[PDB]
Design a protein around this ligand. Structure first.
Ligand SMILES: [Zn+2]
Ligand SMILES: [Zn+2]
Lengths: 8, 204
């Protein structure tokens, strides 16, 4: 349910 | 006016078949390609991530290809005084997320359309800048500025237009209160509808 962003 | 119409919106894993839509569990909220969505952030208590859904796909379940919006505070340069409370930057930062991370839907308006909303709701955002996440560069790199303070237009701040310059002014910058400004029949400035609806002169 939590989202994790990649590093740009 | 001649322009192209790109056949695909996402460059990653083009091999999957697209889902037409995805319904948020327990709701009537249907997400399709092109829609903007709110997602739960890692850190608790902080505002949700905002993303544009570029593509929906599933396995043997459902995945979404997200193009991240950045909040001004989330950007490399941080929040400045001229950024609106509901302002977002459209980045080039892509990610694949579980569709289950989607909390709800929102609408990311154009700047002009945002300023013309009769009511700004919790789901109403806007975007006037694209953002290069790898460098922090903005597109466009130049915008119009106004008032004595020579700042870009912040839609959250009341401004009044001079009947001479057509320039817009923050009341506080010209020595008057918001109430006084609201009461004005006319206004002609001492150097002598919204700035989103102005077409003129640009600064970096
Ligand atoms: Zn000002
Ligand atoms: Zn004036």
């Amino acid at each position: 349910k939590a989202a994790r962003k990649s590093a740009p | 006016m001649a322009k192209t119409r790109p056949g695909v919106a996402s460059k990653i894993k083009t091999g999957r078949k697209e889902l037409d839509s995805y319904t948020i569990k327990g709701t009537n909220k249907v997400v399709r390609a092109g829609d903007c969505v709110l997602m739960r952030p890692s850190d608790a208590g902080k505002p949700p991530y905002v993303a544009r859904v570029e593509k929906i796909e599933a396995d043997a379940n459902v995945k979404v290809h997200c193009r991240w919006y950045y909040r001004p505070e989330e950007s490399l340069g941080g929040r400045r005084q001229f950024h609106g409370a509901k302002e977002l930057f459209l980045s080039d930062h892509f990610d694949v997320q579980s569709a289950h991370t989607i909390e709800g839907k929102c609408i990311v308006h154009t700047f002009k359309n945002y300023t013309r909303l009769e009511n700004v709701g919790a789901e109403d955002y806007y975007c006037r800048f694209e953002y290069k996440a790898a460098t922090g560069a903005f597109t466009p790199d130049r915008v119009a500025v106004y008032c004595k303070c020579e700042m870009p237009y912040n839609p959250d701040d009341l401004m009044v237009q001079c009947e001479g310059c057509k320039d817009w002014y923050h009341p506080a910058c010209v020595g008057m209160t918001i109430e006084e400004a609201k009461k004005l029949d006319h206004f002609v400035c001492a150097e002598c509808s919204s700035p989103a609806d102005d077409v003129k002169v640009r600064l970096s």
